[PDB]
């Protein structure tokens, strides 16, 4: 019958979000509540969310070696309890709303992320014991028969604290932990000198231990250059410890799970740990409410599969005009939306421009990240009239692109699942994607086209060489040409309808989570 599920993360859309993590922790818990399970999320109170009330509960926790208290705020929406951990170090980092969750600059992290996120894991464990759930806390607390779902490296110490602080005294004796991995590139690698700040005994030292040549940039809150080394140096790795201490490790697509366990490249050095522990993938779904052509509240014309020829053409012409491009619904249009970071291959699209004019297509690119990627992005229209770059976070334009574009272009170098392609398919927009991770799972040949592989930099941190960049360009264009060969044909029309008929909701994947959860507690 009824499961008790407590999701712990740094992000819960629409309150806090830097990407897909927030969308999953919004959508999956809502679907689980819909099925009838008791579900809550726990995350930091980064802003004074209007629908959240102070519960008046205070809980002592450690902020590094300092003893401190958190307060818990509580909101309730669509059958899900959202618990927010309140502390000066979460709220007062910036007056700006839903910005700078992980650091002040783009790639730069707060020095004190160790203390901040260790404190989150400690604070979350008390929630099932203390916070009354339901509409206005009428349902009482979740209790000890709880499954903690730890999302990504930020919460990966929770299983250690569960054992050390609770189960060692006979509390939560039957509670379970699930490590839900969204992205293996970030693992909570910290210097070993930060061990004392965790307030854990030495019995967990071996699980935390790690050797590598690739450290993140040093904890000085400005330096952006990662520390590569000729020698392999000793450090801590939170995600490793999380894998070794959880009851089960999951991730966000079967093919990504395969990649992680199959090689040091795919698992970013945690492949053997993932193999040892076992790692299963479940492809993300998505919510339909905000993203569907029938009810979309931003685009110029709503449509469904029957009226796609009318409404989508109008959206296309609207996108074209909005971007300063020649208005003509017969020119195939490619749209990119994503972080301007190595993972997503925005640098490949920009570098591909000289070769792209030959294809007789339009390209629209929307993203934020590196100052000089953003500067390059905005300059693209000058040299290339068929293309347009916009360096902003802009939901309205994202909606215009998803509806108006013929193709959704994702030249990712790695992609645990991806969300753009799911949205795109619901709008009848055809994905053209890199053959990596969950893009392989979500875009079979009936729905879209695969590129050749976009090659990674020879080592992390190292800016990709002009050599490998150009291989990516060629690899992307192979995929685009495959797609353009069918553009405008009866097969094109059919592929759009097949995309729109493709069910990408949380219904099926949520059911798979429930099966895994039921096995853990029985
Ligand atoms: C979009 C992405 O958001 C989250 O990733 C965070 C990192 O967790 C956080 O540490 C920070 O990363 C910086 C890092 O700390 C720093 O040392 C390094 O030099 O620069 C990094 C900045 O790029 O910020 C990022 C971005 O906000 C989540 O942890 C990720 O899971 C999430 N992406 C995932 C999520 C999903 C949803 O399931 C997948 O669909 C998607 O394929 C995958 O990319
Ligand atoms: N500049 C932007 N403006 C608006 N939305 C964006 C922008 N960049 C990314 N997004 C949205 O953020 C989400 C990113 O999710 P996903 O595709 O899983 O990539 P990530 O790896 O960043 O999580 C998508 O839903 C995408 O539509």
Numbering used by the authors: 0 to 521
Question: How is this structure described in the published paper?
Answer:
Starch Synthases (SSs) transfer glucose from ADP-Glc donor to elongate pre-existing glucose chains via α-1,4-linkages. SSs are retaining glycosyltransferases classified within the GT5 family in the Carbohydrate Active Enzyme (CAZy) database. CLg1 (CLg1GBSS) and of GBSSI from the glaucophyte Cyanophora paradoxa (CpGBSSI).
The crystal of CLg1GBSS contains three crystallographically independent protein molecules in the asymmetric unit of which one (chain A) is bound to ADP and acarbose, one (chain B) is bound to ADP and glucose from the cryoprotectant and the third chain appears to be a mixture of the two, although ADP and acarbose were modeled in the electron density. Two loops were disordered and not modeled in chain B, and its glucose is bound in a position equivalent to that of the last hexose, the amino-pyranose, of acarbose in chain A. The crystals of the catalytic domain of AtSSIV and of CpGBSSI both have two crystallographically independent SS molecules in their asymmetric units. The structure of CLg1GBSS has, in the same crystal, a protein chain (chain A) bound to ADP and acarbose and a protein chain bound to ADP and glucose (chain B). The loop between Lys92 and Asp108 is disordered and absent from the model in chain B. In chain A, in the presence of acceptor, it adopts an ordered conformation with Asn97 bound to the main chain carbonyl of Lys16, with Tyr101 forming a stacking interaction with the second glucose in acarbose and with Asp108 binding the glucose in the reducing end of acarbose.
